[PDB]
Amino acid sequence: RGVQMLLTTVGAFAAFSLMTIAVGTDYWLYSRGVMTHSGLWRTCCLFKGLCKQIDHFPEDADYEADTAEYFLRAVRASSIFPILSVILLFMGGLCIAASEFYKTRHNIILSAGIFFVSAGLSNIIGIIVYISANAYSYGWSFYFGALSFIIAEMVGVLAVHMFIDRHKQLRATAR
Amino acid sequence: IAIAPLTITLVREEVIDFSKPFMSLGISIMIKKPQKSKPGVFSFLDPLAY
């Protein structure tokens, strides 16, 4: 019963704050150019102890053949997909907390569930973008981001499962 | 005497002497090398046909 609400909320704040922290730092920890870490925006050294704007997607030594550097490198730049996960998750918790009251038996829970799982898809796809463009160790809050996507996925499972539960109540009492 | 990588032409013969040519060559075109390109999505289907 209410276990759906519990797992739902703890998934919301869990994967949400976890995605935010993932945006914070600890996304890639390795030797810099000398070792440092970076979170896809700016790297911070151990001179040492300071930071520098590191998401310089263009670098002044290349060839840039045809839509490879521009399109892909730009896509990885500004971290669009993970921000898409941010907005979509925001709609997740917001629309579930909306599903608290204002019954609307069928449409809402299913909707937020859909945009929520697909939000997870945006998260994983974004991770793919990041690991891709980066071409040695990873940051820990990176694992926090992936784990956030996972817990999100399970939360969506419980979501849709609760939705078809409501369908079972309605069609059940229908006879 | 000129002992050097000098190109031999008519007008240069028109003023001085050259021995028999010892090393043959042609005009050459030089460019910058690009980096080894990465295929991308194409690797899904690239081989075996067009």
Residue keyed to tokens 């579930």: A96
Check if CATH label 3.40.50.620 holds for domain A3-171. Answer: no
Cα–Cα dist A67/A73, whole Å: 9
Q: Which residues pair with A35 in a beta bridge?
A: A31
B7 belongs to an annotated ligand binding site:
yes
The residues spanned by each domain of chain A are 3-171
B9 belongs to an annotated ligand binding site:
no
Tell me if A21 sits within 8 A of A134, measured CB to CB: no
Cα–Cα dist A43/A54, whole Å: 5
Top residue of B37, B42, B43 to mutate, by most chain A CBs within 10 Å, is B37
Tell me which amino acid residue B31 is: I
Backbone angles phi, psi at A42, to 5 degrees: -145, 135
Cα–Cα dist A40/A14, whole Å: 22
Cα–Cα dist A132/A109, whole Å: 34
Contact A65 B38 (CB under 8 A): no
